[PDB]
Amino acid sequence: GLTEEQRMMIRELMDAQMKTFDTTFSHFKNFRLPGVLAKWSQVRKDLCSLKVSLQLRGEDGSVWNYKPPADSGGKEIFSLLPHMADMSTYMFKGIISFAKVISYFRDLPIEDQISLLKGAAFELCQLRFNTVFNAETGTWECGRLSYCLEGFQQLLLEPMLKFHYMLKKLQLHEEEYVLMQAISLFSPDRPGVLQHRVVDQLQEQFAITLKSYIECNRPQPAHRFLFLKIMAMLTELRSINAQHTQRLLRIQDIHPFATPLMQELFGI
Numbered sequence: 001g002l003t004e005e006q007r008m009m010i011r012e013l014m015d016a017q018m019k020t021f022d023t024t025f026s027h028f029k030n031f032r033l034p035g036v037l038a039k040w041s042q043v044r045k046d047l048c049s050l051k052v053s054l055q056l057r058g059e060d061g062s063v064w065n066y067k068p069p070a071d072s073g074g075k076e077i078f079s080l081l082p083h084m085a086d087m088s089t090y091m092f093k094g095i096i097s098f099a100k101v102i103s104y105f106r107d108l109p110i111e112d113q114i115s116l117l118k119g120a121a122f123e124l125c126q127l128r129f130n131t132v133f134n135a136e137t138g139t140w141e142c143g144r145l146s147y148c149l150e151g152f153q154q155l156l157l158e159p160m161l162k163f164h165y166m167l168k169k170l171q172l173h174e175e176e177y178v179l180m181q182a183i184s185l186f187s188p189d190r191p192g193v194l195q196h197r198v199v200d201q202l203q204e205q206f207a208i209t210l211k212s213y214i215e216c217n218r219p220q221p222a223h224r225f226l227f228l229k230i231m232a233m234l235t236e237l238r239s240i241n242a243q244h245t246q247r248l249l250r251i252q253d254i255h256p257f258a259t260p261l262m263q264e265l266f267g268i
């Protein structure tokens, strides 16, 4: 029950995703790695909930594993930040490419293009990471790189983690993920947005397309209210995003970690 324009819209987003999402992270290389060897307490709390171990599988069959240090409250807590800055940068590049390949996005004035990207980049990054998230093992499988959460459901108290588990449980199709990305990208309320009426109508069309796609393709009782669950999830993500900007701004105060691209995207 999808209109030709709805069908064309999904196709354009699926095409843009295919071209700009390297699911195997093959071109993510030359990144930094942790060394072989007060307002800080706020940074300690914000970081400790987000601890991950890092595994790197080599082409030859070798495996490098990194287990992070204890919080001791010092320096040790930023060991993985240069690596994460490099991952964020690589992902942000893919997100920018994604937006630049979409007709509806290219057509907006350059000022609004920049304003939508600075506002949604983090959200689109997190949505892409959810597709590589293994909820059974608590790990993001990024090709040769694996990021494993270091109890029980006390990690679901961290909004970022609750978001990933709750979104993974919805068992979304590639189309629903790409539609979520479009709804987040075309948010008319991002600071510096001039074409607020155009961006708003565009977003409404992506939301209608998603609502209609679900109605036509997911008839089972488990998918009842799925459109509304997804929409509440995007509201939660906007809230996680505002919180994350604040946490990143605090880390940047104690020690500059942000790459030129992250500085550009976070307004630094």
Ligand SMILES: CC(C)[C@@H](NC(=O)CC1CC1)C(=O)N1CC[C@](O)(c2ccc(Cl)cc2)C(C)(C)C1
Residues within 6 Å of the ligand: 047, 050, 051, 052, 081, 082, 084, 085, 088, 129, 140, 142, 147, 160, 161, 244, 248, 251, 257, 258
């Ligand atoms: C979801 C969360 C646990 C985490 N994912 C990971 O560890 C595994 C990656 C593959 C998905 C993540 O995506 N973030 C978001 C970015 C982050 O806030 C941050 C990055 C760089 C700098 Cl300089 C400062 C802060 C972070 C603290 C790393 C937590």
